């Protein structure tokens, strides 16, 4: 079985870089705290005990309000009067740094105004190893460079709006199947521990770790560790990923929180690098915690050194101050658990004062604008045989497909979106938000046709093929809507347990397109989906004149699309993944059956870096639509490639901040009514053992504490460490690349120039993406695009050296419009 | 068994009044015609042989194109790029003469521009005897006065636009059950003839006949006779309804066409007063006809007088010239049978030149405006506890009910609208048009909310009550949509065979309302339906703050309603029928079982004139919402009732004329150089052997016995006492009393009032009040106006069966003026007038 080597001690924060001020203020306030106050910062108060999906008790005596942590990566979950933004995968389709940033800012503002302190997103894990992975759509792209830039830009958006962003899920949660023991059981599988992602050290650095390094460098204040094991060590107590990779190598200065139920030990986790336990209990509403009372006891009994809990508290506070949250603070002014105005203050036991729990604050501002735009700018034109834009003079328009119409239960009529009815604007699970409304394609396209006095109908039953065929024969254009859905593992739709059972269109979608195309010579396909689908059966039909993929556009869906169909917006989006001929073309098989008896299933990432396009290119498979592909209403030319060569070893000792006293000091205060199921930092009595209630209390302790876990002495700085996101030499710019881009068509538009390198060597991908931009050119207009390659961009991870190395194989640079359309190349000069 | 007395001969046209010029021209052209030409005018060419739902062959030698007859009373049927207008019951709800006329004009324009010569509408039969009749919605109101005025204005709009209108169905087709033998058989009922409406002479004059008198007087060109029997004589060969009531008493100068399959004899029908056979064959595509060849022969063998056939031709030509159809003629430029551009000329057998059958002519203009406006002006505000209008500042709006959303099969995805899926904007059967589009309440209300940055959702599955309650609890206002559907008897939806099985909301409507009202203190109900529905379970719920009935609005439904909900339009519509507490409160039971063995079911109209509000008033039963009831966003006051008395014809017809000559049988044999299209109905004979050419098993059998006394009598006839003009003796239209009242807008916003003028004619068996006059008046806040109207002699008369005439009885009469049939603050005794 794969094994996860220990790395210890857990590195302490140090005021690195842009963290110096936040750190100093964190240390000044933590220095005034008692042990039980510090422990309060680290432990949620229990599932559904307060307002937010996760919530800490705070430090009342120091005016630090409890920290309110709320989903999702795409808008406020479980609230009201909030916006529903497009999914991360749409942000990726835009290839637009500035849109990523604006969508972050827009969300941040909304979160801030609800009294939320920490947004549980954005997401870059799953990266997207498998096309049928249930949560890939929450993230960005299976490409590390694309994902890392847009992930970093989203984080900066959120955090400049004064909310803490949480980069999740760290790391390797590449599938929903077997991610949780209790979920596995509800689906009929018996496992004793969650699925183990088993991955070699090179693959992890070159692929899955890379966006987290960008997040770290961008200043992210929190990271959420994952439900799965990595080499048979749980993600939320993996000393390797947390202490070595995240804190020592990437130099992360913020706080690591657990996924909800991903906390599996008190002492183990704390020493392996975890800083915050969510939602605070061991299981939901168990009234027990691996931390809280236990963490207090563990410090008092000498097992967890004080400097470790001091550091958790400094990391949590430094992040809070880093985004300016102290200046924006207000208690959460909604409840995640009821929409009632009034309710008991503590929802789960229904205890505490009966008072206002919802204030109905409308935080939407004008966010529908950026939503509508981002939807339009994320609609990839995959095929256009001269069919689009529509002119509005189409005599008769057939809108066809359930995916064009309304959810008969209302836009939010399915809990956490756990269905696929009517238009698909949002996939399912925690990664969701309540719509304020939903503009369907039917509504926006019928409104458009009616503005021009045309005739128009929507058929939204996908087995009404008789009606479809009759209408299609009468129509000047047929717009056919199809989708494919997925989501988080705790919800199953039509037998898809999170992950997609297949990449085929849902609800009769292939048969619907064929029924339309067999009858309109101008049949136009619009796909809403969480990732690629199989188009093989109809994409080259002679009557299929255009095909668009619109992702999961959020609340303005129909207007986003209408904007593109009718030429208000020239699509510039590019596919952020590959569209293969068959499922098999992707390889990268999800683990769907027990392969380790009733122990943890073993998920061997035995293809290495070769996911999505890297794998298609390696096997010489030709995708129907390649990574980076998207058409425009204009054409571009790329020419004139020019290349130009450009010109701490130890940490401090772990500090302690403030004083720890006797057990007496941490016993439950006498005046306090203990709320049922509420998690507190206090002890029943000065008897440590009895106050813990742990059947293993005091037994074999030192043997269960790995070597070095309590070593507070100065430590070696890793060669690839020493900065933020890695050693700062990694970000030295070594080569400047320039090309001329011209708009050679007749429509103002955006180009997405894409720069790939070949690093060389028998185990490297043929091409890997490194730089891109989105450039707005009018007809005939030209621009020079210039970009630089850093030391990191040119390197491969060398496991012997434990560092990035520019290997001696010759390297090449490629510039064009997609991973397969690269008309400019050059050998790069040797650099080092 | 009820018996229908003979009335012969069949009255001939005389150029009566406004018909003079059209008659003269018809006579000049029919004088030039051969017998077989004349026959061609009288007989359709066979089901689906040509373009229109009905079509004659015309007279090619005289450059007269075949007449194209097309449904429906609310927009062109079976075509493309036409409009779909609100149903005739919506016109009734407007109580607006001007809107009836404008809708008529917009329809006639579209029909005209398709090359259609005759619109198969509007409808005033059924009148609305039973609240559950399947076709009431195609007509207007169970009130004769309201219905007749709006019927006439509709006819006038159509005909001023250059298309012949057809007043249908004549007469007493008050239900769908048993209306047709093969229809009843398909539903498991074995009858040898169709349902017989059995009505007394006073009831028929005072109720069912009255709107047809208005039609005749307004100049209607065509009348369509009905499927039912009247006292066991078929609608389309009943010499009493056709010869006596319609042609002699009302003095009708145009032509009588059959309903499709309603023609049941050649000789008997022609002598009883039919003028045209549609679609032309005995049954669809039987390649036999009671007319065509048979009518040619019936003249050649002396059984049908030449003057009778000449009279058919003159009435058809006269209706055609009367609307100026000749100045607008073009062949129909669409096909009812296919939407293909190209096809065989003769659809049913697939024969003839393969050529262009569809031109896709866009006839709609900006008619969506009159449709949007009329939908809005026919939305009746039944209840409003200061809930409406909405301001757009509502934070969260819940749109609740299937009836708010889309038909998932597309707006036209049920053939002849034969389902109740999604929003109800058109009921089912032949009274339908293809929508060009359909704006749902969901679309229009969501667009409105979003215009104000509010929050909004539609839940459109009526059993998703869990989601309904959860949403209703968070809403500022819940808009709940419910419907009740019906249609022509050839289509059954959910076992409703034309007629509704009950008056209860469809698709869980009551439970939906209760699920919402139990949770929003601001629950607002919108009803789309063919007529009244049972409201007792929820109308007085403390949480139901407003209730609207919007009928069947046609293509702009959602925009009509939003205009009303958000106060762009102050609603002024008034209920054109009664909302009772129970089905039983209306009495007036449909005949739903065989009650005469396997013979024709007998439908006795025992209630007499006591239908809808007349019956409620007789029985002292209190409607939930009375006939005439409608709220407004303003208030109106009625005062200063005054009455002023005012100062205010041949006795024989000519002899029956004949125009042109009849020659030998051999003149009428199939022309030799002519290919005979399969199923096509021609006027021609196979040989000079009459008997064999006819193929009639009954040819020359007991012929004299089956020709009723007087039926061939071409000599001058007495003029009936109640006859001698258009829509009755012209003395009936003398204005005898002027009425005036001041109507004032006492509220804060502009709006329309609908003053209503009722009379009590007096007598032990007269309704307590019957409507006579109304108008719709637009008033600014504080504005006053003097509403003035007049009562005619007809208005004050009762039908006296012994005189056979209208008579003002000696019982004291009163006038009552107010805002509904139960809200009548002003009363005045009338002085003796005669
Ligand atoms: C001060 O107060 C403190 C607060 O109250 C007191 O704190 C308590 O101290 C106790 C010990 O005194 C703790 O109890 C013991 O904990 C250990 C660790 O359990 C967790 O971690 C397991 C992974 O372990 C590795 O990794 C973590 C870091 O992630 C390290 O810290 C460990 O050192 C260890 O590291 C090695 O491996 C990694 C690579 O993986 C390397 O990198 C290193 O180099 C090392 O090689 C993990 O597997 C555990 O998971 C179990 O528990 C989960 C939580 O419920 C559950 O979801 C999992 O499914 C799994 O369940 C199974 O196991 C548990 C028992 O642990 C059963 O109840 C359950 O039914 C399942 O069977 C967990 O997350 C733990 O391993 C110890 O248990 C072993 O040893 C005892 C005997 O001492 C046996 O009875 C057990 O059966 C068990 O045996 C297994 O392991 C042995 C090898 O160690 C092997 O010999 C056996 O054959 C067998 O396989 C104890 O449970 C306690 O957690 C802690 N409480 C709190 C609140 O923090 C403190 O005592 C007091 N101080 C003083 C001075 O008084
Ligand atoms: C020149 O060319 C012409 C064209 O080719 C030739 O025209 C043909 O002439 C024949 C006569 O020679 C015609 O055949 C006879 O027709 C009659 C009438 O049938 C129709 O009307 C019936 C209702 O009739 C009344 O009302 C009409 C007007 O509405 C009058 O015109 C009638 O005079 C009669 O009037 C009385 O009643 C009304 C009140 O209703 C009063 O107001 C009047 O004062 C009078 O009292 C109607 O019921 C018929 O309906 C049947 O047929 C329909 C299909 O067409 C069908 O939908 C119905 O369900 C119904 O079917 C039942 O009956 C038919 C036969 O008619 C059966 O086949 C069928 O299967 C069912 O049983 C129709 O609409 C008709 O009455 C005659 O038949 C009666 O008499 C014959 C014997 O003479 C019997 O064999 C029959 O069984 C039948 O018996 C009934 O009536 C008797 C009363 O007299 C009674 O004694 C019996 O007991 C019984 O109940 C003949 O069929 C033929 O229609 C016509 N063809 C064309 C194309 O026009 C012409 O001959 C030729 N000239 C010369 C000189 O050569
Ligand atoms: C870790 O996190 C958790 C979660 O955030 C922290 O737990 C919270 O800690 C709070 C203390 O900081 C504690 O707050 C208490 O709430 C009680 C309930 O308040 C509500 O109900 C009342 C009653 O009708 C309303 O007045 C009020 O607005 C609330 O709606 C309060 O009762 C407590 O107030 C008392 O203490 C505060 C100072 O904190 C005084 O200002 C206040 O006047 C009250 O003081 C009396 O009680 C204290 C007992 O400590 C006495 O010292 C003082 O002399 C007063 O005594 C008189 O009155 C009492 C009874 O009223 C009488 O018996 C006595 O004889 C005197 O006459 C206080 O505000 C939260 O409840 C608690 N949350 C939960 C879920 O448990 C935790 O502290 C964190 N841990 C660390 C180390 O930071
Ligand atoms: C009662 O109503 C019916 C139906 O309206 C009438 O029947 C129609 O009568 C017309 C006019 O008489 C018939 O028209 C004839 O059509 C022939 C075929 O037309 C098409 O096919 C050719 C093939 O290439 C095309 O060129 C042509 O444009 C059409 O597309 C024509 O060939 C005829 O013109 C010539 O025909 C005769 C040949 O015998 C010659 O003597 C002449 O040279 C002449 O130019 C003619 O136009 C039509 O077919 C009938 N319809 C049906 C369904 O049968 C009755 O006439 C009417 N009865 C009365 C008494 O009015």
UniProtKB/Swiss-Prot annotation, chain A:
Q: Which SUPFAM superfamilies match?
A: (Trans)glycosidases, Beta-D-glucan exohydrolase, C-terminal domain
Positions annotated with a glycan in the UniProt record: 40, 190, 231, 294, 301, 333, 366, 421, 502, 521, 543, 637, 647, 662, 684
The record's listing under InterPro entries reads: Cellulose_deg_GH3 (IPR050288), Fn3-like (IPR026891), Glyco_hydro_3_AS (IPR019800), Glyco_hydro_3_C (IPR002772), Glyco_hydro_3_C_sf (IPR036881), Glyco_hydro_3_N (IPR001764), Glyco_hydro_3_N_sf (IPR036962), Glycoside_hydrolase_SF (IPR017853)
Q: What SMART domains does the annotation carry?
A: Fn3_like (SM01217)
A Gene Ontology biological process in which this protein takes part is: cellulose catabolic process
Keyword field contains Signal: yes
Its keywords, alphabetically, are: Carbohydrate metabolism, Cellulose degradation, Glycoprotein, Glycosidase, Hydrolase, Polysaccharide degradation, Signal
EC number of the protein: 3.2.1.21
PROSITE patterns per record: GLYCOSYL_HYDROL_F3
Q: Which reaction does it catalyse?
A: Hydrolysis of terminal, non-reducing beta-D-glucosyl residues with release of beta-D-glucose
Q: In which pathway does it act?
A: Glycan metabolism; cellulose degradation
- The residues responsible for catalysis, as annotated, are 259
Can you name one GO molecular function term for this protein? Answer: beta-glucosidase activity
Q: Tell me which family the UniProt entry assigns to this protein.
A: Belongs to the glycosyl hydrolase 3 family.
Q: What is this protein called in UniProt? A: Beta-glucosidase 1
Organism taxonomic ancestry? Eukaryota, Fungi, Dikarya, Ascomycota, Pezizomycotina
């Amino acid at each position: 079985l794969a094994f996860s080597p220990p790395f210890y001690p857990s590195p302490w924060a140090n005021g690195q870089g842009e963290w110096a001020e936040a750190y100093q203020r964190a240390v000044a306030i933590v220095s005034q705290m008692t042990l039980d106050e510090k422990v309060n910062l680290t432990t949620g108060t229990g599932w559904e005990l307060e307002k937010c999906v996760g919530q800490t008790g705070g430090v009342p005596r120091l005016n630090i309000g409890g920290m309110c942590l709320q989903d999702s990566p795409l808008g406020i979950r479980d609230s009201d009067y909030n916006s529903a933004f497009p999914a991360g995968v749409n942000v990726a389709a835009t290839w637009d740094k500035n849109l990523a940033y604006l969508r972050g800012q827009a969300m941040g503002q909304e979160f801030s105004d609800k009294g939320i302190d920490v947004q549980l997103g954005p997401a870059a894990g799953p990266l997207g190893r498998s096309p049928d992975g249930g949560r890939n759509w929450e993230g960005f792209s299976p490409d590390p460079a694309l994902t890392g830039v847009l992930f970093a830009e989203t984080i900066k958006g959120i955090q400049d709006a004064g909310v803490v962003a949480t980069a999740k899920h760290y790391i390797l949660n590449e599938q929903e199947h077997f991610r949780q023991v209790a979920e596995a059981a509800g689906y009929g599988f018996n496992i004793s521990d969650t699925i183990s992602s088993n991955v070699d050290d090179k693959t992890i650095h070159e692929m899955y770790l890379w966006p987290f390094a960008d997040a770290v460098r961008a200043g992210v204040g929190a990271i959420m560790c994952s439900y799965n094991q990595i080499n048979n060590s749980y993600g939320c107590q993996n000393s390797y990923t947390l202490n070595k990779l995240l804190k020592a190598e990437l130099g992360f200065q913020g706080f690591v929180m657990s996924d909800w139920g991903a906390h599996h030990s008190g002492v183990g986790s704390a020493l392996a690098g975890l800083d915050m336990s969510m939602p605070g209990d061991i299981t939901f509403d168990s009234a027990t915690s691996f931390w809280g009372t236990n963490l207090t006891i563990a410090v008092l009994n000498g097992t967890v050194p004080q400097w470790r809990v001091d550091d958790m508290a400094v990391r949590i506070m430094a992040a809070y101050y880093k985004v300016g949250r102290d200046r924006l603070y207000q208690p959460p002014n909604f409840s995640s658990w009821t929409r009632d105005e009034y309710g008991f203050k503590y929802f789960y036991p229904q205890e505490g004062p009966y008072e206002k729990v919802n204030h109905f604050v409308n935080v939407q501002r004008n966010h529908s604008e950026v939503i509508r735009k981002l939807g339009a700018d994320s609609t990839v034109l995959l095929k256009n045989n001269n069919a689009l834009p529509l002119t509005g003079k189409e005599r008769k328009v057939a809108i066809l497909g359930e995916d064009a119409g309304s959810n008969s239960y209302g836009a939010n009529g399915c809990s956490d979106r756990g269905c696929d009815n009517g238009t698909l604007a949002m996939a399912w699970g925690s990664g969701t938000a309540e719509f304020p409304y939903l503009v369907t394609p039917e509504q926006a396209i019928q409104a458009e046709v009616l503005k021009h006095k045309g005739s128009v109908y929507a058929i939204t039953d996908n087995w009404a093929l008789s009606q479809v065929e009759t209408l299609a024969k009468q129509a000047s254009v047929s717009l056919v809507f199809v989708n494919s859905d997925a989501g988080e593992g705790y919800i199953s739709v039509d037998g898809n347990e999170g992950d997609r059972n297949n990449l085929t269109l849902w609800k009769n979608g292939d048969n619907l397109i064929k029924a339309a195309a067999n009858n309109c010579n101008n049949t136009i396909v619009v796909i809403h989906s969480v990732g690629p689908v199989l188009v093989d059966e109809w994409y080259d039909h002679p009557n299929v004149t255009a095909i668009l993929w619109a992702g999961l556009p959020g609340q303005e869906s129909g207007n986003s699309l209408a904007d593109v169909l009718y030429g208000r917006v020239n699509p510039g989006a590019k596919s952020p993944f590959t569209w293969g001929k068959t499922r098999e073309a992707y390889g990268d098989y999800l683990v769907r059956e027990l392969n380790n008896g009733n122990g943890a299933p073993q998920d061997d990432f035995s293809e290495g870096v070769f996911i999505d396009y890297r794998g298609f290119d390696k096997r010489n498979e030709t995708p129907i639509y390649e990574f980076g592909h998207g058409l425009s209403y204009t054409t571009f030319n790329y020419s004139g490639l020019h290349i130009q060569v450009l010109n701490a070893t130890e940490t401090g000792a772990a500090p302690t901040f403030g004083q720890v006293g006797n057990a007496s000091d941490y016993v439950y205060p006498e005046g306090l009514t203990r709320i049922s199921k509420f998690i507190y930092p206090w002890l029943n009595s000065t008897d440590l053992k009895a106050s813990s209630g742990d059947p293993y209390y005091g037994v074999d302790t030192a043997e269960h504490v790995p070597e070095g876990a309590t070593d507070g002495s100065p430590q070696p700085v890793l060669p690839a460490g020493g900065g933020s996101g890695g050693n700062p030499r990694l970000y030295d710019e070594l080569i400047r690349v320039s090309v001329t881009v011209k708009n050679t068509g007749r429509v103002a538009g955006d180009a997405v120039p894409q720069l790939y390198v070949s690093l060389g060597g028998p185990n490297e991908p043929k091409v890997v993406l490194r730089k891109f931009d989105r450039l707005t050119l009018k007809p005939s207009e030209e621009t020079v695009w210039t970009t630089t390659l850093t030391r990191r961009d040119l390197s491969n991870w060398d496991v012997a050296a434990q560092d990035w190395v520019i290997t001696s194989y010759p390297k090449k640079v490629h510039v064009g419009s997609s991973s397969r359309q690269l008309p400019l190349h050059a050998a790069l000069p040797k650099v080092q």
